[model samples]
Target: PEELLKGAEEFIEELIRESEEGAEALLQALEEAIEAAEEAARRKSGTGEEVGAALAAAVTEVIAALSALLTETLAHVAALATQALAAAAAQRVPPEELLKGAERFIELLIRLSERGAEALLRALELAIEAAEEAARRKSGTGKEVGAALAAAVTEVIAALSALLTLTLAHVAALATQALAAAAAQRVPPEELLRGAERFIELLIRLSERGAEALLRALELAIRAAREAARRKSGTGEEVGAALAAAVTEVIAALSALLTLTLAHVAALATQALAAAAAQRVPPEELEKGAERFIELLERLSERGAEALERALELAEEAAEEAARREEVGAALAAAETEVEAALSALETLTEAHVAALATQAEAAAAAQ
Candidate 1:
């Protein structure tokens, strides 16, 4: 029989069991997703929907946490491509697998979040690229600089993309918390929301880089979906118009999230641009590419062109204030000397750096 992708997310334990020891650890972690789901049926917290919503919410976080553990393999892109070429090429893997992993994950998530699918897929698409770029970097030389720059880009985008995946699930969880609060207005649901709050807290922490573990986070989330499905159909907690409304609110959040993320990236990119602007006017590509990247994200997530039209506010303001500065504005701002030189070099070196990294990755892949 064909393996259902959503089924895989919910029951990844069964699918991964024969693979290896890590799969076993996945199973142990999965116990929480399943454990949380089953409790919903008994209203361990309150009304079935109430408990179900909380279970699904808490479970999804565990899923994200688990996914944080599930890496597609920290191998080189060359290795991934080789896996596609060779059935048993254990040393190499492919983007197709990563693609499938994302496909399967969203399938399960779609069960709980119908509205978030496209954005999730798009975000995951960026994530796969990010992870690939990271692996490509780990394998490097003169190409190393290229990989590093690519990695900087990847890490930022990855941070933005993965944040959405967690958001959708958290939305489901929050709906449950909200519903329960409305339904009971008293004790236990307050408890479930507490769990949801903790889950939310974890998400807030991850808003920075949990996506750094793209594949693993994807895998763990998928496993939770499968396990959650296996243990129970927990999504039913959001009922009637409320369910529709919940999805609507989450659907709305995507553009805002995308816009916010773009702003975050812009902060860093502007730093790059300002530093370069003093020495060189800075390429239209820097800001132009930002618009393009934002466009791509906008297309996938829907809405947000104007959401960040003000996006340039940061660019314009920071450029004047940022040239003497360096690194991301918030993380490693550089205000000492000619950071302009550093930024100028990034643009100048782009092509050569990427090729170097690619060659390095291939060489390393070949060595194995």
Candidate 2:
């Protein structure tokens, strides 16, 4: 029990020491952790496990540390934690003083984003699964390593609300990759959603952390997740269902952020409206979703100009997309077949005095 945990204890300490020492040491240790995780994950499951377990344990802990440092670095760079990686890169000076050398974070983002959310997660999954085989009466390589790995994952997520300071490009990569890794692990929604609980919160933080450019990155990932649900999640029919639930977990999660765009929601709504037209989500549910989107935009005036503009843009795109779907029916509402009618209503509400008309729409929905 105590024996396997020793590796994680050392690894975590080494990571802290590396960070404190300077860029080269930190970089070296990061690379070492990556390589260690990779080698072990590559070994045949149950065939060889100890090595992977040891490697994966470090990453789970270090991710927490790296993510925080990223935020600190961003604050120093330009009051914009969002562009820390690039900001630091452009200033590329000496390793010791370069953006404090944002180079460290740049490299980290490159490394993590390139490997992606899936590989890291899948590797961790592989680590825990295989390492478990090394346990002896629950007191060997597997027990301590798997337990540590799980804790590390928890910590990584707990600390990820800041997106670890990765750009949206990398953020989406990390998020979807994490979702994929969770799916690949064959975890049920119960377990997956358990993970999603924190993961979703992180995505919300990330949504707030990122600029509007991130809208597309997140949107595309959701699309990918939906398609993957249909095709990639697995060979069985329900594998798609599981993946759908996973997507829903992500979707439901990010939706909490008022920063969520109506355009984004509409895109998802359109996809879902199409899917639901075939299923039974009911027009009323969609109306609420749409209304919910408009309501979020309303919160913007109380917030700022750029945000308000983003909200308006969201409404425009959402309305445009809705106009394409007549079958969405009265949940979209107004007259005849429900296409022009809904847009007409959207025009009245969303297109009106910013949140003013949107507020009317909300009230309308409430009475109905």
Q: Largest TM-score belongs to which candidate?
A: 2
Question: For residues 113-132, what per-residue lDDT tens digits would candidate 1 score against the true structure?
Answer: 22222223333333323223
TM-scores of all models? 0.26, 0.29
- For model 2, what is the C-alpha lDDT against the true structure? 0.36
Model 1 ranges off by over 4 Å: 1-24, 28-238, 281-368
Lowest summed lDDT across 10 adjacent residues in model 2 is found at 93-102
Backbone clash pairs for candidate 2 read: 98-101, 117-177, 118-177
lDDT of 1: 0.31
Number of the top-ranking candidate, with lDDT as the measure: 2
Off by over 4 Å in 2: 1-28, 37-48, 77-161, 164-242, 259-368
TM-score result, candidate 1: 0.26
